[PDB]
Amino acid sequence: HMERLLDELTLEGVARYMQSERCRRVICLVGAGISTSAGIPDFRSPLYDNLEKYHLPYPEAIFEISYFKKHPEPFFALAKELYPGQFKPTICHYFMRLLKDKGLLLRCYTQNIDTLERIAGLEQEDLVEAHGTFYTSHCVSASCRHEYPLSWMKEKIFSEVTPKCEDCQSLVKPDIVFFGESLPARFFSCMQSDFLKVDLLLVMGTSLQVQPFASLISKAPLSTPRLLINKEKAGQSDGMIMGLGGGMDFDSKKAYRDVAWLGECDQGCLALAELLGWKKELEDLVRREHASIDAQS
Ligand SMILES: NC(=O)c1ccc[n+]([C@@H]2O[C@H](COP(=O)([O-])OP(=O)(O)OC[C@H]3O[C@@H](n4cnc5c(N)ncnc54)[C@H](O)[C@@H]3O)[C@@H](O)[C@H]2O)c1
Ligand SMILES: Cc1cc(C)nc(SCC(=O)Nc2ncc(Cc3cccc4ccccc34)s2)n1
Ligand SMILES: [Zn+2]
């Protein structure tokens, strides 16, 4: 039987393992659930309605790069409607910032496009924005590719002026991955390397149903522990490679490394930080950084 790095399948067992010498390199996989406490909805059933007024040939047209390029106005009107009114990263995001500053964070793979990871102080090298990001935008012409910052894009969105490139007048598109586009190059380079070197996988606020995350959990070594912090269980499996070839196993007789902590991401992170002796550091970090944002309003 495989080496069992967790002494028990609980948050407590994960924390003891994190403090042990073996655990040096943590990868986080994070989705829309880490940003809902920041006032950014995750598009469960509570988006389709906002679409009707745009008179699309079909609803999925809003996500299609092909359709964007000929009829960009629906997308930019939606982006206005959905633009967050403020950008205060959550307790969960700051938990990741603690991981960075303690030298524990190998990588944050995020499905979010809201930039809160960066606002919380994760740097480009810490991040794989698996679904791209609003943080930058580019002219869509292959020979130009001029880059625009978020301040530029925001103004176009709020002014309701379709963003055109100042060099060539082609459309300028936010660097988010529309259906039709390839995942960022950065995604492919990092993943190979990262996932051999990982000691702990921390999966927060994702149902693990969309790409690329849905593959990623099985790329960790087989002994690497995997903690999910989420409102509901996710990533569970119902071929040749047997133990290599499915998902989370939290509840079977054979479960040996995967743990599900059910509830709000912020609360789960606060609970883990508390076990680790980091609760005051985290609370102090959040207060200071939220204050720093509030002082600029
Ligand atoms: N903040 C954002 O950038 C944002 C917001 C909405 C949607 N999206 C896009 O939609 C897709 C969403 O994919 P995903 O896999 O990241 O999310 P998802 O579709 O799996 O939804 C988030 C998951 O977290 C859970 N959840 C919600 N709030 C929670 C909380 N506070 N604590 C714990 N669990 C909570 C939900 O129940 C769900 O399991 C991505 O393409 C993403 O870019 C991004
Ligand atoms: C507009 C804005 C700006 C910033 C900085 N942050 C946010 S977070 C809030 C939010 O849900 N917004 C969104 N904008 C566009 C959305 C749908 C969509 C459509 C088409 C392609 C997509 C490609 C990839 C992902 C989504 C795509 S959801 N929103
Ligand atoms: Zn251009």
Author numbering: 54 to 99, 103 to 294, 298 to 356
Copied sentences from the primary study:
The human isotype Sirtuin 2 (Sirt2) deacetylates both nuclear and cytoplasmatic proteins and thereby functions as a major cell cycle regulator, a determinant of myelination, a regulator of autophagy and a suppressor of brain inflammation. In this work, we present the first crystal structures of Sirt2 in complex with a potent and Sirt2-selective small-molecule inhibitor with drug-like properties.
We solved the structure of Sirt2 in complex with SirReal2 and the cosubstrate NAD+ (structure termed Sirt2–SirReal2–NAD+) as well as in complex with SirReal2 and an acetyl-lysine peptide derived from histone H3 (residues 11–17, structure termed Sirt2–SirReal2-H3). The position of SirReal2 in the EC-site of Sirt2 is very similar in both structures with either NAD+ or the acetyl-lysine peptide substrate (r.m.s.d. of 0.47 Å), and we will primarily describe the binding of SirReal2 in the presence of NAD+, as this structure likely represents the SirReal2-inhibited form of the enzyme. The naphthyl moiety of SirReal2 protrudes into the substrate channel and the dimethylmercaptopyrimidine substituent (DMP) induces the formation of a binding pocket beyond the EC-site. The naphthyl moiety of SirReal2 that protrudes into the acetyl-lysine-binding site is in van-der-Waals contacts with the NCA moiety of NAD+, Phe131, Leu134, Ile169, Ile232, Val233 and Phe234. In the selectivity pocket, the DMP moiety forms π–π-stacking interactions with Tyr139 and Phe190 in the selectivity pocket that is shaped by Ile93, Ala135, Leu138, Pro140, Phe143, Leu206 and Ile213. The binding mode of NAD+ in Sirt2–SirReal2–NAD+ therefore shares a higher resemblance to the conformation of NAD+ in the ternary complex with Sir2Tm.
